[PDB]
Amino acid sequence: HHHHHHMVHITLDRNTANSWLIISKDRRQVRMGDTHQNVSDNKERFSNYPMVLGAQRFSSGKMYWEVDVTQKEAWDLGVCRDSVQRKGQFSLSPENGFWTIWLWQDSYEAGTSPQTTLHIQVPPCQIGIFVDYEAGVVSFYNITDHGSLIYTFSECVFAGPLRPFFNVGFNYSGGNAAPLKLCPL
Numbered sequence: 471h472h473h474h475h476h477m478v479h480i481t482l483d484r485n486t487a488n489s490w491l492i493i494s495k496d497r498r499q500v501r502m503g504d505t506h507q508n509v510s511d512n513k514e515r516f517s518n519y520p521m522v523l524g525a526q527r528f529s530s531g532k533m534y535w536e537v538d539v540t541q542k543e544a545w546d547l548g549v550c551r552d553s554v555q556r557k558g559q560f561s562l563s564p565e566n567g568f569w570t571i572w573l574w575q576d577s578y579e580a581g582t583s584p585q586t587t588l589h590i591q592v593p594p595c596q597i598g599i600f601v602d603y604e605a606g607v608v609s610f611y612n613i614t615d616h617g618s619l620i621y622t623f624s625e626c627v628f629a630g631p632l633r634p635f636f637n638v639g640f641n642y643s644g645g646n647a648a649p650l651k652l653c654p655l
């Protein structure tokens with residue numbers, strides 16, 4: 471792909487984080503802590519899952535960023551509406567305001583309803599995410615495999631400002647402690 475020139479500097483919004491997450495000083499990395507991180511509760515925090523939003527809001531234009539997923543067993547990545555549900559149980563779907571892909575149990579899937587199997591020959595260590603607001607497109611790229619396309623959501627109905635979306639996943643296995651990291655431009 472040739473989307474690299476739309477690169478944006480994403481930072482994580484601490485106030486939206488699940489209370490077990492640990493965000494680095496530079497707001498560019500996040501991982502699952504082994505306990506509650508001693509923060510007050512608020513209406514923005516994702517309560518049920520290890521999720522956090524980017525601080526940036528997008529309502530027009532083309533945007534691109536990259537995320538490092540090295541040695542993780544489970545994660546979700548993409549964008550979502552600013553007004554997505556924060557509390558309780560929900561599925562990641564465009565109907566609920568999410569445009570995402572994930573790794574889970576050794577398979578990659580797009581967060582359609584129902585979910586779509588992805589075909590990845592080279593397990594990615596870094597993912598590129600491209601949003602074209604006007605066109606209604608969210609695309610995912612395999613940076614480890616020379617930028618090959620993973621998935622395109624088209625005919626998106628954003629219906630609001632978009633925020634970068636992250637889920638570090640649970641660590642029931644002891645094999646999923648590694649962070650998500652926003653990669654430098």
Ligand SMILES: NS(=O)(=O)c1ccccc1OC(F)F
Pocket residue numbers: 488490517518519520
């Ligand atoms: N398993 S846990 O108690 O450490 C936990 C941590 C963050 C969010 C949800 C959660 O548990 C359950 F709601 F899924």
